Amino acid sequence: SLSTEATAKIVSEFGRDANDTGSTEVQVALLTAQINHLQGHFAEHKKDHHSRRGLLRMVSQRRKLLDYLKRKDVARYTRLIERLGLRR
Amino acid sequence: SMQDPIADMLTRIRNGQAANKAAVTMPSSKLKVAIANVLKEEGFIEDFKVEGDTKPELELTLKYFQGKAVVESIQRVSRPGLRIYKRKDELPKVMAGLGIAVVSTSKGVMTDRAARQAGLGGEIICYVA
RNA sequence: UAGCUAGUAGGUGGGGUAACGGCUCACCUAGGCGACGAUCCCUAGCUGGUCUGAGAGGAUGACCAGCCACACUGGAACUGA
RNA sequence: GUAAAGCGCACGCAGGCGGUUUGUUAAGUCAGAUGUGAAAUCCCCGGGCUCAACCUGGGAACUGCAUCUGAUACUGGCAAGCUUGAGUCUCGUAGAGGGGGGUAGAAUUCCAGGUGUAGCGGUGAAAUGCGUAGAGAUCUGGAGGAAUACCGGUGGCGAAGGCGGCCCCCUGGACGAAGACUGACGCUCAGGUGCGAAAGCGUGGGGAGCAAACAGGAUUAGAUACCCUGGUAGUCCACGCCGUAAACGAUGUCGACUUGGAGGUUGUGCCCUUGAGGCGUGGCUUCCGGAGCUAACGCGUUAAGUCGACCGCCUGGGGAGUAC
RNA sequence: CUUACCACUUUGUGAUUCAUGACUGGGGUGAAGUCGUAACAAGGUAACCGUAGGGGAACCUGCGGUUGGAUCA
RNA sequence: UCGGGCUCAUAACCCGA
RNA sequence: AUGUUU
RNA sequence: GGGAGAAGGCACGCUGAUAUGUAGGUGAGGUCCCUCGCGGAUGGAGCUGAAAUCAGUCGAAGAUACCAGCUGGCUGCAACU
């Protein structure tokens, strides 16, 4: 997984408030990260029909939690995705 | 439960008395009490206490007579995805009037009696007996 | 039977009907319908009601009454409320 | 669960379902009013035929549809939240979880050389087969492929299939500890997508051992077998395909509850720790069994008990999971 | 008289459905026919599921799996 | 082929000619 | 191996 | 990929209008701009010029001449050029 030194960084950048691991801004970023990284890893082997599942489980959550914004505070949704370019 | 609350409530009690349990407990909720009143005030439970101004807790003190339990015939009805509603000329009558069916009428929830007595229908609930 | 549909779906103006409307025409947009099941295949006149049944339900629509359609077959208009 | 019947397993769109508090709305719903639901059947009471059949008065009824005004408990919508659901952060915990790359020792086969000689091998016996062109055994050197003894276990991990020497790299999940943060963001899921034992299929590699096919030998009345001697595909690898299994707990998933007993394994708090140990509390796991459930066998807090949400499926046997 | 629309009707080519068809796959019945004995007991090689190959037939054999398997393994 | 045996009885198997 | 008789 | 120009059909001349010749094509002045001219932008004079739709019309016939696949169905063989 992402280095312990990593998550603690991204959070202080996306976390709705100074140092907080829970809000979508923080949730998403923390997820998209491991997703972008693993992408390369999977570009290798590509036979790990197990590790890939996790890739899905978390990715399936990305689009999932991302909806919470719409269903709730939409004002940030677009402001959050525009950050990682997600959705496209 | 992780879907329909009230459903568990009615169960908790029927389960407890099933094994001569003292008094089962469950997280109190406004609707839970409205159905609780129709128990203590309708002869079915000693009484219910509270606990937690933010994290409440219902406390239905079960009962038993001779060598058997009191509320030994309870079941839910207007469950989710199957909610039942009926008019005055359709109102229930648990076990030939011998029993009672909690009914959430527009004028608060109350026993089957208060239904006709007040003249109106409501979201039928369980079949206490 | 999983796709279906150009007067097809809508918009303008002409024309038309007792009257609204692609009803029809010209032009314009490229719609409209579909699994809450279109299109296609088989079947059937519809209802009050009738039979059965504890009820829910199932089966049915003869004679009575309301509605619809048909009149040797296919097609058309004339008169006239 | 075994009588017919749980998709082999996951993810997830639509769809269905939704912890908790307040405010609001009043759509679902409840109340009353009104139009309207033809008449006649029907039914209640009551008349006319001498009765009855039949005829007939009134009323009820016609679940219905809509509208008007009210009710606001629950349901739904909107606003505002809250935290126990679920999720992130920190620190650790165990493990055959996965993919890749190296490497190790034991053993068989083969090849080579020495020693040594008339048997070896196999079976119920035999025979085929291998031996004097010197096998077998015994010792020395080499090649190669596949598998990882002991550990090892009712042990562990994984969605399932399934996954064992050792080391490294990349990487998924689970679990416990304190709090911190999120604030219902969840459950299930037709369709859709992905994974799929073994055999099998395509291309190219690989090939020690085992072995469909096949060939001998034997058994037998026959023996297209069981047994012996050999032995090709395959079993191995890389990529692609097929998607089946008694894909089995023959028991869908999630959540809530309901006596207990012994053991396994894996976190964590604590007790002269003052012992191995003594007392707690969690995750997963075997055997037993209580009420209950069950046609019975049996299941029994990891239910087949008592409840709820969603989905899959069953509806006599053969024909047939066949035909088109 | 002319044009437009359109009926009977003509032509081509498909779809569909019904009937029939030499011969033929598998299936079902029926006369104490012929060949075996595969299965139910440890059925005398434990059986069954997938799958693959083979054989007069039941079936045999290979690979994995299940117990819905007998004995003191 | 036949005659005898083996079995509850067949075949097979065993004996004899 | 079978007996409606390997 | 094909089989396929499968098959089988409809329309084809000319005149007028839309439009005095249309869409399109080509692009001269005049204006503007800047290395500053074999510049560009803009301008649209002229030139050229398909095709469609209407309406009307001559013959027996408008792809009128030359030119220019016959088409399908069953089967052997050999992949195919």
Ligand SMILES: [Mg+2]
């Ligand atoms: Mg108009």
Ligand SMILES: [Mg+2]
């Ligand atoms: Mg008819």
Ligand SMILES: [Mg+2]
């Ligand atoms: Mg009945």
Ligand SMILES: [Mg+2]
């Ligand atoms: Mg007519």
Ligand SMILES: [Mg+2]
């Ligand atoms: Mg069954």
Ligand SMILES: [Mg+2]
């Ligand atoms: Mg299953």
Ligand SMILES: [Mg+2]
């Ligand atoms: Mg009526």
Ligand SMILES: [Mg+2]
């Ligand atoms: Mg509300």
Ligand SMILES: [Mg+2]
């Ligand atoms: Mg497990």
Ligand SMILES: [Mg+2]
């Ligand atoms: Mg394989």
Ligand SMILES: [Mg+2]
């Ligand atoms: Mg192969």
Ligand SMILES: [Mg+2]
């Ligand atoms: Mg037990």
Ligand SMILES: [Mg+2]
């Ligand atoms: Mg036929």
Ligand SMILES: [Mg+2]
């Ligand atoms: Mg047998």
Ligand SMILES: [Mg+2]
């Ligand atoms: Mg056997």
Ligand SMILES: [Mg+2]
């Ligand atoms: Mg026989």
